[PDB]
């Protein structure tokens, strides 16, 4: 080899050092969102118990039996609220992945004739505690978790049934 070859390998080393990285932030966001998924799943038992014993979805954390929304917090989750039987988990606004900062995911259940189907995904809103249908929460701000940061099993749409 010669000096040109050494310069070429130095340039190749520089290329490798300055190589672009994949969307590892998306995978880290999924890992952190798993914590909110678990926190929301924790309240499923209470929500289902209230719905079965009263015939209507729990309006909020009070008669759902779960703790206060601000008190259900984890390392990356700042709140877990209940709205008409829909459990919405909102992540923290700091010390978390930038892609899921102060973003919300949802867990809602539809009562079937033989079972109760639980759906996890983007935020949804149930208008009435007795309603059997859900719809997207609202536009507002960027409070919706992108499907890139949700597991493929946690991307259920509002219209899904």
């Amino acid at each position, epitope marked *: 080899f010669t000096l040109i070859e050494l310069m070429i390998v130095i340039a190749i080393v520089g290329i490798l050092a300055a190589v672009a990285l994949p969307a590892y932030q998306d995978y880290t966001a999924r890992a952190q969102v798993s914590e909110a998924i678990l926190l929301a799943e924790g309240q499923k038992s209470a929500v289902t118990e209230y719905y079965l014993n009263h015939g209507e979805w729990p*309006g*909020d*954390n*009070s008669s*759902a039996g779960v703790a*206060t*929304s601000a008190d259900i917090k984890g390392k990356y989750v700042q709140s877990v*609220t*209940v*709205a008409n039987g829909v459990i919405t988990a909102q992540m923290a606004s700091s010390n978390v992945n930038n892609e899921i900062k102060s973003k919300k995911l949802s867990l809602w259940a539809k009562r079937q004739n033989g079972s109760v189907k639980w759906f996890c995904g983007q935020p949804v809103t149930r208008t009435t505690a007795t309603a059997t249908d859900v719809a997207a929460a609202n536009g507002k701000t960027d409070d919706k978790i992108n499907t890139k940061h949700l597991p493929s099993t946690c991307r259920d749409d509002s219209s899904a049934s």
Partner: nanobody
Framework: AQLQLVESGGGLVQPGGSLRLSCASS????????IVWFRQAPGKEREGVSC????????IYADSVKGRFTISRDNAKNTVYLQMNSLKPEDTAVYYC????????????????????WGKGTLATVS
């Protein structure tokens, strides 16, 4: 998690007049309680008048007071205002403001049920 409710604004008023009752809540999570205005008249049991939810976008009023009473909430001042218009002689009572722990600031449901804390009450009479 004790909550203190103070009612103010009650007093004498003429029939067909306007009144405003302010219920101020001081506590750890006063903005987490649905605020329910009940009334009690001499010779009858306590009955609910108007409930406002934690989110403030869901308000329910009694049938006898629907269309005349308006309930609003201010979390910055931590006070709930009940405005009565076209007061009737049947409204002579004592009004209590009570807080129901909803466990969620964004709660859209509130009703006359087991209230965690109660207010002293203000005598609102019209003659």
């Amino acid at each position: 998690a004790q909550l203190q409710l103070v009612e103010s604004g009650g007093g004498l008023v003429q029939p067909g007049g306007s009144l405003r009752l302010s219920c101020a809540s001081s506590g750890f999570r006063s903005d987490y309680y649905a605020i329910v205005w009940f009334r009690q008249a001499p010779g009858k049991e306590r009955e609910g008048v108007s409930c406002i939810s934690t989110s403030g976008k869901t308000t329910i009023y009694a049938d006898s007071v629907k269309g005349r009473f308006t309930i609003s909430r201010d979390n910055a001042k931590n006070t709930v205002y009940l405005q009565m218009n076209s007061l009737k002689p049947e409204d002579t009572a004592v009004y209590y403001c009570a807080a129901d722990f909803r466990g969620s600031r964004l709660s859209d449901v509130c009703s006359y049920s087991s209230m965690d804390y109660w207010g002293k009450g203000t005598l609102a009479t019209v003659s």
